[PDB]
Amino acid sequence: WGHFYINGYNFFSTFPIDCISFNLTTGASGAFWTIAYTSYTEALVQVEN
Amino acid sequence: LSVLHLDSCTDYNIYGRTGVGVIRQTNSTLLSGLYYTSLSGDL
Amino acid sequence: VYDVTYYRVNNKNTIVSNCTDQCASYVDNVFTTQPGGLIPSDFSFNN
Amino acid sequence: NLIENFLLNYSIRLPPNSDVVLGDYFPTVQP
Ligand SMILES: *[C@@H]1O[C@H](CO)[C@@H](O[C@@H]2O[C@H](CO)[C@@H](O[C@@H]3O[C@H](CO)[C@@H](O)[C@H](O)[C@@H]3O)[C@H](O)[C@H]2NC(C)=O)[C@H](O)[C@H]1NC(C)=O
Numbered sequence A: 001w002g003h004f005y006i007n008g009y010n011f012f013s014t015f016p017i018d019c020i021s022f023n024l025t026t027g028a029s030g031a032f033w034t035i036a037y038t039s040y041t042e043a044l045v046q047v048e049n
Numbered sequence B: 001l002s003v004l005h006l007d008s009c010t011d012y013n014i015y016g017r018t019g020v021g022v023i024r025q026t027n028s029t030l031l032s033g034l035y036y037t038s039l040s041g042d043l
Numbered sequence C: 001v002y003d004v005t006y007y008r009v010n011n012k013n014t015i016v017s018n019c020t021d022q023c024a025s026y027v028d029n030v031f032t033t034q035p036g037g038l039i040p041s042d043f044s045f046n047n
Numbered sequence D: 001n002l003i004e005n006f007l008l009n010y011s012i013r014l015p016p017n018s019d020v021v022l023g024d025y026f027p028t029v030q031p
């Protein structure tokens, strides 16, 4: 729906999005990361700090 | 504008939240969020 | 090989060492997805 | 030591001054 969340906060938004193109790398740093494709659900979440 | 007066009593408007208080820099770390409030709704 | 294994590499001195316990709890951010699309109860949620 | 040597070649691409943790489908020790 165009909402961009950074570190959990909705800092900005755009028009609804059908497709997102991207090309991201850490390069020589040798760092790893993940991309997750998710859906909304109700859950009980315990938060600390 | 973003004029912030520290270590003194000020009339603030922070990301839409207004009130009177003393704002100080802390050495704490919180990774998530932009602002934090109390159970009463206060900043 | 079915999954991801982590090793620490120190190039200051290259020294390769195992990362299996306390350090594995700071960088391991990957998991097997359970049926239904559920995140395992032992996931760290670091990022 | 065969696994160690693998990591020694794999890590050649790293910067001259770094401490990193590498994660991949590396050869393992049990199976
Ligand atoms: C993304 O950045 C975070 C930090 O913002 C990285 O997490 C950090 O990981 C290091 C280990 O690589 C942790 O250091 C440890 O500190 C304790 C001090 O008690 C020491 O005993 C351990 O031996 C080790 O030196 C550090 O605490 C940790 N910081 C966190 C969790 O905020 C994270 O690894 C980075 N991302 C990726 C993909 O690597």
Ligand SMILES: *[C@@H]1O[C@H](CO)[C@@H](O[C@@H]2O[C@H](CO)[C@@H](O)[C@H](O)[C@H]2NC(C)=O)[C@H](O)[C@H]1NC(C)=O
Binding pocket: B002, B003, B004
């Ligand atoms: C928010 O943090 C930034 C970054 O540290 C502050 O910007 C610096 O303020 C000092 C003091 O006047 C300047 O000398 C630096 O040049 C500023 N850095 C940059 C990149 O502009 C900013 O003042 C803080 N915001 C508030 C409202 O205090």
Ligand SMILES: *[C@@H]1O[C@H](CO)[C@@H](O)[C@H](O)[C@H]1NC(C)=O
Binding pocket: B027, B028, B029
């Ligand atoms: C912040 O500074 C105080 C000293 O006023 C110190 O006691 C406290 O441990 C520090 N906290 C952090 C996270 O550095």
